[PDB]
């Protein structure tokens, strides 16, 4: 590929000289000062010049375009010549000289996203960033960590400097590497010393340019270049580096630019793993261990030994995936400072990936809780972190309906689960029509007098619940609660019922009617590929067994899981926790082959 480059003027009256970037169309001015006696023209150049004609004899018209490409890189100041005869009817053919200078200057980056550094004549528009499996543009990492080795470099980006100029070419010319003042602050870029130093910043914050020393010959310099920040409302997360040719020769009148190339590198951006993705290593933070160790051994797992204060995502480049971990308080690592009750990990899941009516979304989407209208008692996720999350584009986030919620949370009445058949996973919601339904089953065979809370400190009966009419009204709003979410998840995912699961879940009004768990929340369960642990209901036992443990067996054993119930799921400190977190296999889609 070659793009468009100069335009000289030549004249009888004076030489002229000129330098050219192999790569780059040059085009020729004749008629500017061609003379009135002539009528035509022709060219003659060194074997090293192309010369096209458009529009070997040819006259003086203005609109033929005459264009140069070189061949190679020059060896001396004027290696290559042309030379513009002007002839007429009668008139000897008066001459015009041009001699030119060849220069390689080539900018290569991963713009191919490929993990090699491939040049800029390697792509069609090389200052544009584009999605897709045909795109272009290479891809930045951040720096997540609160003389420079080969390790540090690992994760930066690798971007060459080639160029072959004569020997004395850099006594009248300079190239200068410069950066936007706007995106400053959020690149660095560091010369390699061949291994580079913590000294060797070129580009970064307050410096935006550079002024590169380069000697004459064939030479190729290296620098690695890292993210300052992720995007966000204020940063759509695109960074140019551009390299300038100034020429210098004169030392009365400022330098001239003779050149321009840049690179375009887009900021990989911070993306969650759903409950579907393998699990690498689960942490957590008392006989519940040996539920939740049996259960990491049966699924082939790791655990480690020490909540919703922090989450585990990744950022990937074609060189390298990193774990980074984002944490709200109140290797790769990233904190946030201010504070509503949404504002939680917690109100955060990721859906499988899916395909909505056409629209393929391969990393899944992002739902978080929210209010159905803003209201003066209404509670909201925090505009920053909304606009955060929606900035990283390749997971488009879904807003819910969780505001009904006492804590206010999605993943209290959401989950998913891997699945061997349909889209490869089930949507798991809550369901208080569910439990109704086996809880009337189970007074319909004379069990009535079954006692929920059993194993704690006050209990109560499958009787006295079931014919509480002020506890049905409440499960009957909570019931409309969710299937406002399930319509809405059906919609923004593209389900049909068949991917839909009812886990049977009652639940209770606290203060300001808002809902809570009545007993332990199952639907909110450690998803660890095959192997689900689930929190204990406690639920009445009919046949020694708990009746609720039978029915999300009847459930989920079909799918191919292995139900695994943990005694003490939840705590309670005299607010709800539970101390597991999972970090998960990233997905092997490729973020930049999507397209948002
Ligand atoms: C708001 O109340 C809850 C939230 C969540 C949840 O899913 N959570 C936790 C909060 C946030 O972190 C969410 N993101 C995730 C789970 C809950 N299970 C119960 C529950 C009910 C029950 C009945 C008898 C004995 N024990 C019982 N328990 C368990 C015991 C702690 C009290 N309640 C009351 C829960
Ligand atoms: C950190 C963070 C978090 C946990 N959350 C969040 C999201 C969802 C929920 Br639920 C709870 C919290 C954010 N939301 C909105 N902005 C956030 N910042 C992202 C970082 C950005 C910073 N300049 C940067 O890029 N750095 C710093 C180190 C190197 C890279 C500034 C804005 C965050």
Same mark, same amino acid.
């Given at each position: 590929?070659?793009?468009?480059?100069?335009?000289?003027?030549?004249?009888?009256?004076?030489?002229?000289?000129?330098?050219?970037? +192999?790569?780059?169309?040059?085009?020729?001015?004749?008629?500017?000062?061609?003379?009135?006696?002539?009528?035509?023209? &022709?060219?003659?150049?060194?074997?090293?010049?192309?010369?096209?004609?458009?529009?070997?004899?040819?006259?003086?018209?203005?609109?033929?375009?005459?264009?140069?490409?070189?061949?190679?890189?020059?060896? &001396?100041?004027?290696?290559?010549?042309?030379?513009?005869?002007?002839?007429?009817?009668?008139?000897?053919?008066?001459?015009?000289?041009?001699?030119?200078?060849?220069?390689?200057?080539?900018?290569?980056?991963? /713009?191919?996203?490929?993990?090699?550094?491939?040049?800029?004549?390697?792509?069609?528009? *090389?200052?544009?960033?584009?999605?897709?499996?045909?795109?272009?543009?290479? /891809?930045?990492?951040?720096?997540?960590?609160?003389? +420079?080795?080969?390790?540090?470099?690992?994760?930066? #980006?690798?971007?060459?400097?080639?160029?072959?100029?004569?020997?004395?070419?850099?006594?009248?010319?300079?190239?200068?590497?410069?950066?936007?003042?706007?995106?400053?602050?959020?690149?660095?870029?560091?010369?390699?010393?061949?291994?580079?130093?913590?000294? &060797?910043?070129? @580009?970064?914050?307050?410096?935006?340019?550079?002024?590169?020393?380069?000697?004459?010959?064939?030479?190729?310099?290296?620098?690695?270049?890292?993210? @300052?920040?992720?995007?966000?409302?204020?940063?759509?997360?695109?960074?140019?580096?551009?390299?300038?040719?100034?020429?210098?020769?004169? +030392?009365?009148? %400022?330098?001239?630019?003779?050149?321009?190339?840049?690179?375009?590198?887009?900021?990989?951006?911070?993306?969650?793993?759903?409950?579907?993705?393998?699990? *690498?290593?689960?942490?957590?933070?008392?006989?519940?261990?040996?539920?939740?160790?049996?259960?990491?051994?049966?699924?082939?797992?790791?655990?480690? /030994?020490?909540?919703?204060?922090?989450?585990?995502?990744?950022?990937?480049?074609?060189?390298?995936?990193?774990?980074?971990?984002?944490?709200?308080?109140?290797?790769?690592?990233?904190?946030?400072?201010?504070?509503?009750?949404?504002?939680?990990?917690?109100?955060?899941?990721?859906?499988?990936?899916?395909?909505?009516?056409?629209?393929?979304?391969?990393?899944?989407?992002?739902?978080?809780?929210?209010?159905?209208?803003?209201?003066?008692?209404?509670?909201?996720?925090?505009?920053?972190?909304?606009?955060?999350?929606?900035?990283?584009?390749?997971?488009?986030?879904?807003?819910?309906?969780?505001?009904?919620?006492?804590?206010?949370?999605?993943?209290?009445?959401?989950?998913?689960? %891997?699945?061997?058949?349909?889209?490869?996973?089930? !949507?798991?919601?809550?369901?208080?029509? &569910?439990?109704?339904?086996?809880?009337?089953? *189970?007074?319909?065979?004379?069990?009535?007098?079954?006692?929920?809370?059993?194993?704690?400190?006050?209990?109560?009966?499958?009787?006295?619940?079931?014919?509480? $009419?002020?506890?049905?009204?409440?499960?009957?709003?909570?019931?409309?609660?969710?299937?406002?979410?399930?319509?809405?998840?059906?919609?923004?995912?593209?389900?049909?019922? #068949?991917?839909?699961?009812? /886990?049977?879940? @009652?639940?209770? !009004?606290?203060?300001?009617?808002?809902?809570?768990?009545?007993?332990?929340?199952?639907?909110?369960?450690?998803?660890?590929? $095959?192997? !689900?642990?689930?929190?204990?209901?406690?639920?009445?036992?009919?046949?020694?067994?708990?009746? !609720?443990?039978?029915?999300?067996?009847?459930?989920?054993? %079909? +799918?191919?899981?292995?139900?695994?119930?943990?005694?003490?799921?939840?705590?309670?400190?005299?607010?709800?926790?539970?101390?597991?977190?999972?970090?998960?296999?990233?997905?092997?889609?490729?973020?930049?082959?999507?397209?948002?």
């Amino acid at each position: 590929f070659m793009a468009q480059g100069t335009l000289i003027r030549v004249t009888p009256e004076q030489p002229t000289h000129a330098v050219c970037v +192999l790569g780059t169309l040059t085009q020729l001015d004749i008629c500017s000062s061609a003379p009135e006696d002539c009528t035509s023209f &022709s060219i003659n150049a060194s074997p090293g010049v192309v010369v096209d004609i458009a529009h070997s004899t040819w006259p003086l018209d203005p609109g033929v375009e005459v264009t140069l490409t070189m061949k190679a890189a020059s060896g &001396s100041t004027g290696d290559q010549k042309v030379q513009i005869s002007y002839y007429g009817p009668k008139t000897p053919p008066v001459k015009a000289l041009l001699y030119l200078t060849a220069v390689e200057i080539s900018l290569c980056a991963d /713009i191919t996203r490929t993990g090699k550094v491939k040049p800029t004549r390697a792509v069609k528009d *090389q200052r544009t960033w584009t999605w897709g499996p045909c795109g272009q543009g290479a /891809i930045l990492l951040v720096n997540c960590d609160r003389v +420079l080795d080969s390790e540090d470099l690992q994760d930066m #980006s690798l971007m060459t400097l080639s160029t072959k100029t004569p020997k004395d070419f850099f006594t009248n010319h300079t190239l200068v590497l410069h950066v936007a003042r706007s995106e400053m602050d959020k690149v660095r870029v560091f010369q390699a010393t061949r291994l580079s130093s913590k000294c &060797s910043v070129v @580009l970064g914050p307050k410096w935006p340019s550079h002024y590169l020393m380069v000697p004459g010959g064939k030479h190729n310099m290296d620098f690695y270049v890292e993210a @300052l920040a992720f995007p966000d409302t204020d940063f759509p997360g695109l960074i140019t580096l551009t390299i300038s040719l100034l020429d210098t020769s004169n +030392l009365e009148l %400022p330098e001239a630019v003779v050149f321009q190339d840049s690179v375009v590198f887009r900021v990989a951006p911070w993306i969650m793993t759903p409950n579907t993705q393998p699990p *690498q290593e689960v942490y957590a933070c008392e006989d519940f261990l040996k539920s939740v160790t049996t259960l990491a051994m049966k699924a082939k797992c790791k655990l480690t /030994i020490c909540q919703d204060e922090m989450e585990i995502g990744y950022i990937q480049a074609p060189h390298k995936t990193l774990p980074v971990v984002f944490d709200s308080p109140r290797f790769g690592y990233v904190t946030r400072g201010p504070i509503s009750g949404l504002d939680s990990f917690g109100n955060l899941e990721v859906s499988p990936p899916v395909t909505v009516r056409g629209k393929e979304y391969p990393l899944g989407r992002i739902l978080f809780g929210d209010s159905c209208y803003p209201s003066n008692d209404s509670r909201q996720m925090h505009q920053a972190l909304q606009d955060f999350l929606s900035a990283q584009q390749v997971q488009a986030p879904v807003k819910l309906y969780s505001d009904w919620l006492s804590v206010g949370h999605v993943d209290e009445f959401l989950s998913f689960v %891997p699945a061997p058949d349909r889209k490869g996973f089930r !949507l798991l919601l809550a369901s208080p029509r &569910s439990c109704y339904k086996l809880f009337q089953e *189970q007074q319909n065979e004379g069990h009535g007098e079954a006692l929920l809370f059993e194993g704690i400190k006050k209990q109560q009966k499958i009787k006295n619940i079931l014919s509480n $009419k002020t506890l049905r009204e409440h499960n009957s709003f909570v019931e409309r609660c969710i299937d406002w979410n399930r319509e809405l998840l059906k919609r923004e995912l593209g389900l049909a019922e #068949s991917d839909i699961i009812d /886990i049977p879940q @009652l639940f209770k !009004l606290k203060e300001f009617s808002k809902a809570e768990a009545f007993f332990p929340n199952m639907v909110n369960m450690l998803v660890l590929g $095959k192997h !689900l642990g689930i929190p204990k209901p406690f639920g009445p036992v009919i046949n020694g067994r708990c009746c !609720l443990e039978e029915k999300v067996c009847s459930l989920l054993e %079909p +799918l191919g899981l292995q139900c695994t119930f943990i005694n003490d799921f939840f705590t309670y400190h005299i607010e709800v926790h539970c101390g597991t977190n999972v970090r998960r296999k990233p997905f092997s889609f490729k973020w930049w082959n999507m397209v948002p």
